[PDB]
Every structure is written in structure tokens, then in C-alpha cells.
């Protein structure tokens, strides 16, 4: 449970990274050039063959190997803090399993993305005869996913109501848990994420007539219920009002694509500002977020070079 032990290893791993020259040089290359350069880089350790499925699988495997080891090799409160960094994949896998069970599709069709829980647990959870049994199979000592599944289990059985309440409660519970530990940077990143998620949900539900309070999330500090209601009800100048907050560059934008790009840039900057705590969790956050951005950019450039999309449609996605 010593952050120094984890942080030295994370410093070595972050030293094993791909430079911006790799992203710029592949930005005008064919799928075979992207394949050959990828194979020569450390990202091409497990690159088996050629083709977009191969590129995607290789990216997934390399990311799992070099970012999924974080919750292990560290215990105690160090583990309890570093576990609330890589939890979105677990949230997605649980949501996918819940939806598949609700509809009726086989449990062997889901993707089962590499997360923080156990793959055997994920497989066995589908066969649970009750949602409580599925939660118990997915239950961990301190998993926010398990806590939120218990919380939503007090609302409904395996239905769309449970599916939505689970996501809302998991986001709120992750916010609370991050606030419940004394890590300077984790609380800030979690709060900024909560605010960004609330704003993005308001933009996504634009004009849907839904109750802003019922769709709102709590935990952030760069938005409020009034601003959520304004943005949801179409007042696209509320995003112009939130100036001064860390998400201040998003003033005057009214499109979903531009809003997503802006929020991604802001969150990436905030996570890259965590490198100021070399003996805290901050270097771990920086390594995780930089790895995720590298994976996303690599997959986008490789898909562009494979399916022959034009250059101008992807260069704007490597802005940050």
C-alpha cells in the first residue's frame, strides 16, 4: 500500500510511451504503413496479422496488459483509491450483461470488455437466477459497482428502470467514494468528471422534455441544477454562462461533436495536471489517462487508414 512502489513502476511504464511524432507520421500513411510502424512500436507486441479487426484486438490486448495491472500489485487504501480510476469498462460490461439478460440474448454474445472484476465472475453472473444473485456474484469488498447494484436493487428487478437507476447511482456513488478519501487529485478529477457527465447528459437529452432534476447528477462543482435545466430546455447559452469554471472553453458551442471534443480536451488536460504528485495517485492518473488517449487516437488513425476515410475528417480529432 505504498504509492512510491506503484509510482516508480508507473513512471517506467509511462516512459514506455509513443510520442506525438508517431501520431503525426501515421496521419498521412496507408493501412500497410500503419501496420508496419505499429508492429515496430511497443503497441505492436501482440499485433498478429493485418486488418482493422486485428488492429482493434491488438490495441485492446496491449491496453489490457499495460493498464489492467494497476489494481493488482497494490493493496490497502492505495488499492481502494486506484480502483476508482479504471471502472468504466466494468460499468459497461455489467450494463451490457443486464441488457442482454433483460432482452433474452445468449450470455455468449456479449463482448465482456476487460475490466477490474473477474471474467469468471462475469460469466457466472449471467446464470444467476435473481438480480440479487447476480449482484452477489459481482459483489466485491468495496466495489462501487456492487454497492450501486445493491442500491438500485432496492428499486426494481431486471428492467430498464433498474438499468438506468444503476448507471445514475454508480456515477453518484463513485463521486461520493472519491470524496470519502484524502487524495488531493482524485476528488478533483472525479468532480470534474461528474460535472462533464451531467452537462453531456443534458446535451444528449436536449428537447426530450425530461425532468432536469430527475436526469441530473450530483457531485460536480462546475454546474448546477438551474444550469442543467437551462441547457436541457435548449438554452444553449448556459454553456456560455459557465465561464471561469475549469470547463470554460465550451462557450458558444452548440453541436454534440464539438461539445464532446471540448469536454475530452478539458478532462485530458485536468488529468495531465496530475503529474505534479510524483508520490501520490497523480502519476497513476496521468499514466492511465494518457494510455487511454493513445489507444483512442491509434484506433481512429488505423480505422481511417484501413477504410480509406479522408485526412481532413480525422486531423480534427487529434487536436488535444
Amino acid at each position: 500500500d505504498d504509492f512510491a512502489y506503484l509510482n516508480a513502476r508507473v513512471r517506467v511504464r509511462r516512459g514506455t510511451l509513443l510520442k506525438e511524432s508517431f501520431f503525426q507520421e501515421a496521419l498521412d500513411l496507408s493501412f500497410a504503413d500503419f501496420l508496419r510502424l505499429l508492429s515496430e512500436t511497443v503497441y505492436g507486441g501482440e499485433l498478429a496479422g493485418q486488418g482493422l479487426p486485428d488492429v482493434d484486438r491488438a490495441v485492446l490486448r496491449t491496453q489490457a496488459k499495460l493498464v489492467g495491472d494497476l489494481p493488482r500489485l497494490v493493496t490497502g487504501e492505495a488499492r481502494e483509491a486506484v480502483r476508482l480510476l479504471l471502472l468504466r469498462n466494468d460499468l459497461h460490461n455489467l450494463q451490457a450483461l443486464l441488457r442482454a439478460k433483460a432482452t433474452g440474448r445468449p450470455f455468449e454474445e456479449v463482448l465482456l470488455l476487460p475490466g477490474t472484476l473477474r471474467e469468471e465472475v462475469w460469466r457466472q453472473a449471467y446464470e444467476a437466477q435473481d438480480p440479487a444473485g447476480m449482484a452477489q456474484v459481482l459483489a466485491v469488498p468495496g466495489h462501487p459497482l456492487a454497492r450501486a447494484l445493491r442500491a438500485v436493487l432496492r428499486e426494481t428487478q431486471d428492467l430498464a428502470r433498474v438499468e438506468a437507476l444503476l448507471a445514475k447511482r454508480f456515477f453518484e456513488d463513485v463521486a461520493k467514494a472519491a470524496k470519502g478519501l484524502d487524495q488531493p487529485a482524485l476528488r478533483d478529477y472525479l468532480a470534474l468528471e461528474v460535472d462533464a457527465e451531467n452537462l453531456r447528459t443534458a446535451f444528449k437529452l436536449q428537447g426530450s422534455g425530461l425532468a432536469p432534476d430527475a436526469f441530473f447528477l450530483k457531485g460536480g462543482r462546475f454546474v448546477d441544477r438551474v444550469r442543467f435545466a437551462r441547457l436541457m430546455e435548449g438554452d444553449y447559452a448556459v454553456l456560455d454562462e459557465l465561464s471561469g469554471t475549469p470547463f470554460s472553453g465550451l462557450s458558444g458551442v452548440r453541436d454534440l461533436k464539438a461539445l464532446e471534443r471540448g469536454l475530452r480536451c478539458v478532462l485530458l488536460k485536468e488529468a495531465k495536471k496530475g503529474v505534479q504528485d510524483p508520490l501520490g495517485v497523480g502519476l497513476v492518473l496521468a499514466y492511465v489517462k494518457e494510455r487511454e488517449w493513445e489507444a483512442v487516437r491509434l484506433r481512429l488513425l488505423a480505422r481511417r487508414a484501413y477504410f480509406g476515410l479522408p485526412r481532413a475528417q480525422v486531423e480534427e480529432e487529434v487536436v488535444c
Partner: protein, 649 residues
């Protein structure tokens, strides 16, 4: 000890096997092995068998869900004596009635909640909308807002046409009763502007925000009026239906669970053309319980009750505790840790011997023991009533079986905890400080308080010596049993390690009793040298590089037994001091608030007992389960539980 068991091998006609399994399941125990890899078929169920399993599983699920909806428990009962079709035809009506009643209750309750959610706002809105409920140009729009900050919305209202649609709080003192009525959509634009400047729209869900104001309010009030009677009738009907159908539902649940278990078991058999076979394990003493059932097989099946495997590679063999009546009620205190491997020893009998005596040595207060006896009386009466001890505060669901076992344990504890108390005075605390029935050479009484514990300077050496002696006995027995088990299982390395540990401990103890104790080491020098030599020889001849540090740790585990003396002395001294202070305050001081002094002494003693009894009870078992069981193995290899076949309810 871990009961001996034998592999029953049996085979017969592929059709008769479906009833042979039923007979065995209705019989006693047999842990069925998977049996499939036997150079034969995996006995996969027929398509009609698979359909029968699905139907019975549906029956079980429906029975459980309907029982939960009615609120009844899932405890078993007498079986349901019906086929699949009859069981389905019985479960369907009850499920239908429960579903309908639950839907009706949800509807009535939700209607009541909705109507009461906006009663005063509805009254205020009905008051204000007395003349503009249905208008051609535009209709009045209500606004349920917070307290009278109505100027906040009036700012935007005055920015719009204030020449019409004035809004203010008229009634519904729970808040500001806002509403605006005007011609054209200028009122709607003003509503948007007031929303921007701070205002809310009173569009309640359903007919409240979707019907004409007055008629909708009247309908809401009528629903709120009529909902009580409907809710009462629904509740009465549901309760009566549950009371009528509980027994049938439980019977169906038991029958369904039994049948589904039988089918899923049938999926475990081995098979071939026209044939089925099994290879389950059964305890050697239980043989007539199987034999007196599987004798009447249709073909008079093989029923070859073949031997156990030896200790040689039989870690899959099931284990069960098999202890005499004296020791069984205490097996609860020992089952919570790892199960024995198969041929390794069972520590179950040691505990009833060595735990209660240690506890009695720990606590000696005669009055405290009498209090424990009274508490046991209460618990035993509750168990006698068969009503389970439910304590929701600590999440306690003590069933009568556990209550009885704990009562037996407590009685056997109280015996020694009173005997050792009377063997050391300290009655009711320190009652001898008011009347010395027990007494000693400082003020002689009716009987000798032998080995007085309060006087530290006298008996401390004796008590510490006795404690360390009992500890040496326990650790030596544990090491010996480890040696014997390592010899029996032909583990030469284990035998060497155990022998070396015992020899090294003997050598260290000899050198200790010579140097740190008395002089005259003539008869002990040879023993000390022998022990050290034995330790070295065993370490060399076993090559395990066994830690002399581990020998030291074993030595510490030996020495730790002084905790009994320590805890006992602390408890006795504290109780005696408290009783002395109480007696002084009551009689020696004032002598008219004797009631106050006795009450204070009682309260202090009760608080001390409540706050210390937990540790007092925990320490002996801690010593046992940390030292003896660790020495004798018994926290490795984990075993395999003896699950019998079926026979629920």
C-alpha cells in the same frame, strides 16, 4: 473423528434407474460423484426429461414468487402430491389472484399518494381558476412555486404584458399559489420568460396536468376519498388469500424442489446402451440406511458397497464430524475453520475438555456465574417455546437448534466457572468484605479461601506456573499428534519436522529451567544437550532448513498460556475493588443510603460484566484455535463437504 466412508458402485436398466435415483434420494445420505468419465456415456437427459425439468423449475419459481408476494415464508412443509399438470393448475390461480391484488393495491396507493401530493395546491388552484378554466384565446396556467419570492417571476411578467395575467399567492400556505391567465400565447411567452427569470410550471403528472382544472380537481378529490375503502378491501382479500393458500404453496415448493433436484442429479449418472451406473460415497456406519432401500430395486441392482480408497490420493472423499453426544454441541465452536483433508485428525473432542475449565479459571465470581445461569434460563425457555431468537439489532437469527446447542455449552461452562470460583472465594464479587463465609488467616471465616487470588504476592508464582504447565501440555500434545499423522500418511519429512520441533523445544525448556530458574542443573544438563542435538540432527536429516525462528515462534506459542492467569487476576481484582468500594460507601459511610450504595455497586458490577464478558469468553477459544489447531495441522488442505442426496423437507 472424521467418519470412515465407502464408494457404493451400482448399475441397472436405463429405464429402472430413473426410479432407483428416486428411491436413493428418498433414502438417507449419498454424496454422488460426477462418474461420467468411465469409458461409457454421460447419461444425458431425454428431450422430454429436459421439458419436464423446465416445467418443474417454472413451478418452483412461480411458487416462490407467489409466496413472496403473499408475504409467506419459503420454509418447507409436507410435499405436494400432484403431477406436473396438477401442480401447474394449482399454482396458476393463486399466482393470478396475487398479481391482480398487487396491481390493485399499487394502483390505489399510487392514486392516494398522487392526490395527497397536491391537495392544498389543488385547492388554491380551484380557488384562483374560478372564471378562466376554459377560455378560447388562451387558458390559465398554474405555477406551484416556493415561498413568496413571486417578484422573481413578476420581473419577467412585467417585462411581458403586465396588463393581464396577474399572479400571486392566494391560498395553499405550503407555498406561493401562482397562476396566470391571459389571451393569446403572450402568456406562454411570459411563462418561458418567467422560467428564465425563475418560475416553475404546475403540470402535475396525469389528469392533474392534463385535464380541465375544476373537473380534474374534483376527480382527484373523489379518488382520494374512495381510495381508503378500496385499499382496505384489497388488503383484506390479499391477507385472506395468503392465509388460505400458504400450506398448498409450501407443499408445491417442496415437491418442485425435490423433483428438480432429482432431475439434475439424473444428469450426473454414467450410462450405456440400455444401462445406467453410479459411484457415490456413503459413511460406513450408514450402510443399512441405503441397503434397506436399495434392496427392493426393480432388477435388484448390483449395490456393490466397495471399500474406501486409502489415504492414498483420496482428497475428494467427503468428510463429516461423527462425534459422541458429549462433544457434538461444542462442534459449533470448531466447524467455522477449514475442513480436515481426509485421514488427518479431528480436534473436535479436545475443546469440550480444555475450554470450559480454562473459562472457569478465567472467571470465578459466584454472583456473575449465577447471573449467567439466569441468562441461560431465559434463553432455554425461549428455545423451549420453539420461537426463534430474533435480534434485528445485531442481525441474529438463532434457530432453536443453535439455541439448544449454545444452552448445553453454557451449562457445561457454568459448572466449572462456579467450581473454580468457590475454590477461590470471590463470591458475588467480594461479599466476604461484608460477611466472610469464605475466609483466610487475616480474618478467618466459615470455610478456607484456598489459593487466594486477591493476594498477588502469595499465589502469583503458583498460578503462573500452573498456566505455563497447561500450555506446555497442549503444545506437546499437538506436536505429538502432528508426528503421528505424518507417520501414518507416510510423510517422512513431516515426521522429521515434528520430531525436530519437539526435541528443540525440550532443549530450550531445559536450558531455561536451569539458567533462568533454580540452580542444580545436574539432572537437566543431559536433557538440554540431548534436545539441542536432536533438533540439529532432525534439521540436517530433513534438509527442510526449518527456521530455528519457527522453533522460537513455537516457544512463544507455548509461553502464551499465561494469558489465562493474567485475565483471571485482572477480573478478580477489579471486581473485588468495586465491591469493596460499594460496601464502604453504603455501610461504612452514611449507613442510611445503604440502598444507594448497593445500587451503585450493582450498576458498576453489571457494567463491568457487560463490557468484559466478551473478551473473557473469547480468550480461551483464542488460545485453543490459535495454538493447538495450528500445531496439529488443521488449517491447511481444506477437505470436501459431505453433501447428501436430496430429501428436502
Amino acid at each position: 473423528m472424521i467418519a470412515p466412508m465407502e464408494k457404493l458402485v451400482l448399475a441397472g436398466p436405463k429405464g429402472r434407474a430413473k426410479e432407483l435415483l428416486q428411491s436413493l434420494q428418498q433414502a438417507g445420505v449419498v454424496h454422488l460423484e460426477t462418474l461420467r468419465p468411465e469409458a461409457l456415456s454421460a447419461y444425458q437427459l431425454s428431450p422430454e426429461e429436459r421439458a419436464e425439468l423446465r416445467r418443474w423449475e417454472a413451478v418452483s419459481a412461480g411458487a416462490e414468487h407467489t409466496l413472496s408476494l403473499l408475504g409467506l415464508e419459503a420454509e418447507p412443509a409436507r410435499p405436494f402430491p400432484e403431477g406436473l399438470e396438477a401442480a401447474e393448475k394449482a399454482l396458476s390461480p393463486i399466482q393470478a389472484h396475487a398479481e391482480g391484488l398487487t396491481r390493485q393495491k399499487q394502483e390505489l396507493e399510487e392514486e392516494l399518494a398522487l392526490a395527497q401530493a397536491y391537495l392544498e395546491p389543488l385547492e388554491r388552484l380551484a380557488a384562483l381558476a374560478h372564471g378562466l378554466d376554459k377560455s378560447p384565446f388562451l387558458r390559465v396556467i398554474p405555477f406551484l412555486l416556493t415561498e413568496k419570492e413571486l417578484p422573481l417571476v413578476e420581473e419577467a411578467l412585467r417585462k411581458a404584458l403586465e396588463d393581464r395575467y396577474l399572479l400571486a399567492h392566494e391560498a395553499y400556505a405550503g407555498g406561493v399559489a401562482a397562476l396566470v391567465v391571459v389571451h393569446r400565447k403572450e402568456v406562454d411567452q411570459a411563462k418561458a420568460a418567467l422560467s428564465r427569470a425563475g418560475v416553475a410550471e404546475l403540470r402535475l403528472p396525469g389528469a392533474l396536468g392534463e385535464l380541465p382544472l375544476s373537473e380534474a380537481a374534483r376527480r382527484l378529490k373523489e379518488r382520494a376519498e374512495a381510495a381508503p375503502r378500496e385499499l382496505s378491501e384489497v388488503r383484506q382479500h390479499l391477507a385472506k388469500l395468503a392465509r388460505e393458500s400458504a400450506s398448498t404453496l409450501q407443499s408445491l415448493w417442496t415437491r418442485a424442489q425435490d423433483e428438480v433436484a432429482r432431475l439434475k442429479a439424473l444428469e450426473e449418472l454414467a450410462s450405456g446402451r440400455f444401462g445406467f451406473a453410479l459411484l457415490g460415497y456413503v459413511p460406513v456406519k450408514a450402510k443399512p440406511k441405503v441397503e434397506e432401500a436399495l434392496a427392493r430395486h426393480k432388477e435388484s441392482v448390483v449395490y456393490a458397497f466397495e471399500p474406501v480408497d486409502e489415504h492414498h490420493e483420496a482428497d475428494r472423499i467427503p468428510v463429516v464430524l461423527d462425534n459422541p453426544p458429549w462433544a457434538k454441541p461444542f462442534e459449533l465452536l470448531v466447524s467455522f475453520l477449514n475442513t480436515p483433508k481426509y485421514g488427518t485428525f479431528d480436534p473436535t473432542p479436545v475443546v469440550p475438555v480444555f475450554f470450559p475449565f480454562w473459562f472457569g479459571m478465567i472467571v470465578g465470581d459466584i454472583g456473575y456465574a449465577l447471573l449467567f445461569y439466569l441468562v441461560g434460563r431465559w434463553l432455554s425457555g425461549y428455545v423451549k417455546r420453539n420461537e426463534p431468537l430474533v435480534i434485528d439489532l445485531f442481525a441474529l437469527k438463532l434457530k432453536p437448534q443453535v439455541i439448544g446447542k449454545l444452552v448445553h455449552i453454557l451449562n457445561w461452562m457454568v459448572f466449572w466457572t462456579v467450581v473454580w470460583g468457590v475454590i477461590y472465594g470471590e463470591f458475588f464479587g467480594t461479599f466476604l468484605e461484608h460477611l466472610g463465609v469464605f475466609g483466610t488467616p487475616e480474618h478467618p471465616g466459615l470455610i478456607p479461601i484456598l489459593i487466594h487470588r486477591i493476594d498477588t504476592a502469595k499465589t502469583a508464582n503458583l498460578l503462573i506456573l500452573l498456566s505455563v504447565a497447561f500450555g506446555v501440555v497442549l503444545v506437546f500434545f499437538g506436536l505429538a499428534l502432528r508426528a503421528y499423522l505424518g507417520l501414518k500418511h507416510r510423510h517422512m519429512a513431516h515426521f522429521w519436522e515434528g520430531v525436530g520441533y519437539l526435541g528443540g523445544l525440550v532443549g530450550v525448556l531445559a536450558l531455561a529451567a536451569s539458567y533462568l530458574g533454580n540452580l542444580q542443573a545436574g539432572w537437566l544438563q543431559g536433557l538440554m544437550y540431548l534436545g539441542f542435538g536432536v533438533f540439529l540432527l532432525a534439521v540436517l536429516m530433513s534438509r527442510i532448513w526449518l527456521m530455528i525462528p519457527e522453533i522460537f515462534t513455537q516457544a512463544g506459542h507455548i509461553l502464551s498460556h499465561i494469558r489465562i492467569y493474567a485475565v483471571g487476576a485482572a477480573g478478580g481484582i477489579l471486581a473485588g475493588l468495586l465491591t469493596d468500594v460499594g460496601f464502604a460507601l453504603a455501610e461504612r459511610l452514611g449507613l442510611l443510603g445503604v440502598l444507594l450504595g448497593l445500587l451503585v455497586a450493582g450498576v458498576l458490577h453489571l457494567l463491568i460484566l457487560l463490557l468484559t464478558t466478551l473478551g473473557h469468553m473469547l480468550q480461551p477459544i483464542r488460545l485453543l484455535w490459535v495454538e493447538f489447531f495450528t500445531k496439529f495441522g488443521f488449517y491447511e488442505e481444506n477437505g470436501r463437504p459431505y453433501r447428501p442426496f436430496k430429501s428436502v423437507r
